[PDB]
Structure 1
Amino acid sequence: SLLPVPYTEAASLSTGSTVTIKGRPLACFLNEPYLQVDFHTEMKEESDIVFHFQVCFGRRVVMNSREYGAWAQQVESKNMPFQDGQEFELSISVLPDKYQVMVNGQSSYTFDHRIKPEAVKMVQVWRDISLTKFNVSYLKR
């Protein structure tokens, strides 16, 4: 739909920042479409990833970081608040010790900081979705 996918935006994050995404899977859950949100340390797509959030709709979520080019300790969740065929609203809040992922208003996943969020310079949203909204807050100092 409206925004380009893969979607790339320069970004700065700190405690109190929120990244808000509105989109829809491109396929029914039976076909296992994916969604991925990556918080990168540079604008280049091959740069390190402080927080990698990957949904296999209807199946599982995996989270990780990519440090000096190498994937670190993968974490897995079977929590699946996303609904088959429906638009979703995803919010990722930067808390002092972790990222908190809300789905349609419900706390759904967390990921403890492995690298300070101040290292982020870019966010990429990609894989099997359309995207109508992407917003980063910049109100706090």
Structure 2
Amino acid sequence: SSLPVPYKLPVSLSVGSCVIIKGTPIHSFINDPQLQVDFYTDMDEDSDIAFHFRVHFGNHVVMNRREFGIWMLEETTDYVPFEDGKQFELCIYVHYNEYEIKVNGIRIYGFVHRIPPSFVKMVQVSRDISLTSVCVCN
């Protein structure tokens, strides 16, 4: 891995920001690897989460948020266009009303903001991936 995992990146996000994560799963899909990305409100892992994204490669994606320490109503989609054994590009674009999630250039979901994205101060990338790069662009 070019970068350590879990990877905790301090960030400042605004409307128009894009988080770009490039990496490769460390297991084949028959072994049920996962990728997780959390938009944390502080560096502390127990802080609230504006957007939690967990990919079960070859299966489905689960999303949620944690407010006042409480996980809210989970959201899901079966559209997970990641390829077995290959590098992926995951883009999370901050729109005024939602995070748009793109996988390898394919829009898969829009997760609506329940707190403003400018409250996000750390992005954590975790679980079963080798991380090649992480970029924050505007």
Query: Smaller-chain TM-score range?
Result: over 0.9
For structure 2, the residue ranges without an aligned partner over 5 or more in a row are none
Q: Is 1:12 aligned to 2:15, yes or no?
A: no
Q: What's 2:129 paired with?
A: 129
Q: CA deviation at 1:88?
A: 0.1
Mapped to 1, the partners of 2:37 and 2:80 lie a distance apart of 16
Name the CA distance, whole Å, in 2 between partners of 1:26 and 1:87: 10
TM-score of the pair, normalised by structure 1: 0.96
Runs of 4+ in 1 over 6 A off after TM superposition: none
1:27 counterpart SS class: coil
Partner-residue secondary structure (3-state), 1:13: coil
Can you give the 5+ residue segments of structure 1 that lack an aligned partner in the other structure?
Answer: none
Q: Pairwise mapping of residues 39-118 of structure 1 onto structure 2 (< 5 A)? A: 39-118=39-118
**d(CA) in 2 for partners of 1:80, 1:43:** 28
Deviation at 1:70, TM superposition (A): 0.8
CA-to-aligned-CA distance 1:43-99 (integer Å, 9 cap, x gap):
111111000000000111000001111100100100020011111001000001100
Q: CA deviation at 1:126?
A: 0.2
Counterpart amino acid of 1:121? Answer: K
Percent identity over paired residues: 55
Q: What's the C-alpha RMSD, in Å, of the aligned pairs?
A: 0.7
TM-score of the aligned structures, taking structure 2 as reference length: 0.98
How many residues are matched? 138
Residue 28 of structure 2 corresponds to 28
| SS in structure 2 at match of 1:134 | strand
SS at match of 1:136: strand
Name the CA distance, whole Å, in 2 between partners of 1:102 and 1:66: 22
Mapped to 2, the partners of 1:32 and 1:67 lie a distance apart of 29
